[PDB]
């Protein structure tokens, strides 16, 4: 299962 | 080794005047690929490409889905933010590409986690073996680095690689059970190809082999033979296995006396072929 | 500036023996950025039914992808993936050699 996203670069 | 690892590969692409940036992501384990998605499908959704992951229920798939569907608006805030920080222009087109998991050793626990990214395929920032920083590649990746920093990003990714990452691999070993516990050894021959004159070409071939790391070597007792040798790159052939083939020009009137050696997960022993008329 | 040029290699799944069904493939790898045009020809036409893989990537950030389609080889017919790239300046060809 892909991660959650992050924050923005 | 019975060690496995499970990564995820994503490319955006911007596209100025028509519309967002394209999103696609593929998953795969060792060398299998298990998922797809593609934000220009007419329906976009992850979807099955390995027999083992269609016994997933809807509830996965949807939720997958949505953390694509997400990523593709994040990615795309991304896009925009690097865009100004080269000082580059709104007409042109720019790829930001990321790769992220996770290797695991026997005993199922995590040996090393990645999380970096390229943009227009140059490294721009990755996070480092101790899942706690970041190496910037320059000056405008130092201006990520420290949104990244600030907002202890590296927190949440240590998070899925070491809880998650890991957890999800050992369930995909489970639902793959033999298709990925098991290496498929070489089907392997040498042939014969005369430049027709005083002198020919042996090719040794290696097919329908999985994982793809092999060793195609030709060498005189020990000692290696590369005169001339043509090694192709590995490739697959369609089916999830690969291919391989190496070749070397020998005097060919007789000099038969040169052999190829084979190495592979899949084989007991290495192997040492010969041609056979 | 940070482009790189397709390498291509075109070739059976299957060993080929004449009439009987195989698959041909053309790998395309090494290039980017991911824009690419391939297409697989048979004496010169362009073949209608022809899929490929998801796009991914390699460690070095380079892209590729595997196009096929179902063939059954003749003594007689020959077989050729065309490529076009941002870096190419006009389509690349290459043919199909069952021995390679």
Known sequence: ?9 | ?277 | MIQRTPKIQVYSRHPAENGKSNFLNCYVSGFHPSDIEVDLLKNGERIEKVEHSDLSFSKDWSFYLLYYTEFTPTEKDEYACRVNHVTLSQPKIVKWDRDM
């Not at chain 2, 014969?192 to 090719?203: F, N, Q, V």
């Open chain 1, 1 to 9: 299962r892909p991660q959650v996203p992050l924050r923005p670069m």
């Open chain 2, 1 to 277: 080794m019975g060690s496995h690892s499970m990564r995820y590969f994503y490319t955006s692409v911007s596209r100025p005047g028509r519309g967002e940036p394209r999103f696609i992501s593929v998953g795969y384990v060792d060398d299998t690929q298990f998922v797809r998605f593609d934000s220009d499908a007419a329906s976009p959704r992850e979807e099955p490409r390995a027999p083992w992951i269609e016994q997933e229920g809807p509830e996965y798939w949807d939720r997958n889905t949505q953390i694509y569907k997400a990523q593709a608006q994040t990615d795309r805030e991304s896009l925009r933010n690097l865009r100004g920080y080269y000082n580059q222009s709104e007409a042109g087109s720019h790829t930001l590409q990321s790769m992220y998991g996770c290797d695991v050793g026997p005993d199922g626990r995590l040996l090393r986690g990645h999380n970096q990214y390229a943009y227009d395929g140059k490294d721009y920032i990755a996070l480092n073996e101790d899942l706690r920083s970041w190496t910037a590649a320059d000056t405008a990746a130092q201006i990520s680095q420290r949104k990244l920093e600030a907002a202890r990003v590296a927190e949440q990714l240590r998070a899925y690689l070491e809880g998650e990452c890991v957890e999800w691999l050992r369930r995909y070993l489970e639902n793959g059970k033999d298709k990925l516990e098991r290496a498929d050894p070489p089907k392997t021959h040498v042939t014969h190809h005369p430049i027709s004159d005083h002198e020919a070409t042996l090719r040794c071939w290696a097919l329908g082999f999985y994982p793809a790391e092999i060793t195609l070597t030709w060498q005189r007792d020990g000692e290696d033979q590369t005169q001339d040798t043509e090694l192709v790159e590995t490739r697959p052939a369609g089916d999830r296995t690969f291919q391989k083939w190496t070749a070397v020009v020998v005097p060919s009137g007789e000099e038969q006396r040169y052999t190829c050696h084979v190495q592979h997960e899949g084989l007991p022993k290495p192997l040492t072929l010969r041609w056979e008329p």
